[PDB]
Design a protein around this ligand. Structure first.
Ligand code: HEM
Ligand code: HEM
Lengths: 149, 149
């Protein structure tokens, strides 16, 4: 697909030190990010409806942590598997009955809380920019795959 | 609204010199951005349908320039007016019959081509990071307002 070629290209184009630091950010903070994501998303009245028990909370947080690491640590050979995952998540969101714009709001929250983590790192400003750029484009590409399903 | 408070907060949190350079990038390069946006979007078969004549092309490019400048140059007192703008655009997209994932794809294209423009500026790496961050968050918050229709 066209999305596969873009995602693959994005990963292939990124230099090893940048992909390495993107993976570092993900692994180091995915747990924190998943917790903050849930807290902020819960505030939204239209989103709070879908989060009504500790089992859902536990499952979503673990799933979000896994998602963040998988996307940001993506290798070229992971792309095809990553694409199928987005389809799977879309199916689940569809069955639960979660509106696309509610999911999009989730992506915005994620991209929002990801930045201070990269900003507070000890990387150079040039490194922070490229890591954040790689991260944003990766998340947006994943969002498009998920929503176009 | 909660959306107004979020957009307001985003502008309030970004230091004046950073928002200033974001506005500078927008005005100086809105023309390039609108043209390249149109070219890339046209490649998508599902989006090419909505762009079938020179009158629409011409008006859309002009509309995009204004949109980019308005969003990236957002002041606190502009937030309320900007929200109404996104609603208006949403109405137009709805009447024409443009799918949400097609619009979302447009936003991804815009964010994608914005980065090399910021990267190519003569600002410091630290400035580029903060300008790019403000820009991404601004475009994303605007997209959510639009998609929430
Ligand atoms: C307001 C936004 C969102 C809400 C309310 C929401 C809600 C949910 C819920 C309730 C589940 C099932 C939990 C369970 O199994 O008990 C789920 C599944 C999942 N979500 Fe979302 N979601 C949102 C957005 C997102 C975003 C932005 C991502 C990734 C960037 C994401 C990734 C996933 C994953 C990986 C799963 C599990 C997939 C599976 O079980 O096969 N979600 N979501
Ligand atoms: C694939 C993506 C998109 C397609 C195919 C598309 C298509 C169109 C078309 C055909 C029009 C009619 C313009 C006219 O006839 O005068 C329009 C209006 C407009 N679009 Fe979109 N659009 C897309 C995404 C976007 C995005 C991402 C933005 C902003 C970030 C945007 C902003 C606007 C604005 C400001 C107008 C005119 C508003 C008005 O007339 O009041 N569009 N769009």
């Amino acid at each position: 697909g066209a999305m596969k070629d873009e995602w693959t290209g994005l990963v292939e184009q990124a230099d090893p030190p940048i992909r390495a630091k993107a993976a570092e950010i993900a692994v180091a903070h995915a747990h924190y990010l998943s917790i903050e994501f849930y807290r902020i998303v819960r505030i939204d009245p239209h989103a709070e409806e879908f989060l009504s028990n500790e089992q859902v909370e536990r499952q979503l947080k673990s799933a979000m942590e896994r998602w963040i690491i998988n996307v940001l640590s993506a290798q070229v050979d992971d792309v095809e598997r990553l694409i199928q995952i987005q389809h799977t998540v879309a199916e689940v969101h569809a069955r639960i009955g979660i509106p696309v714009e509610i999911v999009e709001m989730g992506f915005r929250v994620l991209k929002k809380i990801l930045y201070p983590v990269i900003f507070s790192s000890d990387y150079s400003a040039a490194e922070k920019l490229q890591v954040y750029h790689f991260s944003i484009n990766s998340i947006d590409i994943a969002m498009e795959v998920m929503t176009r399903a």
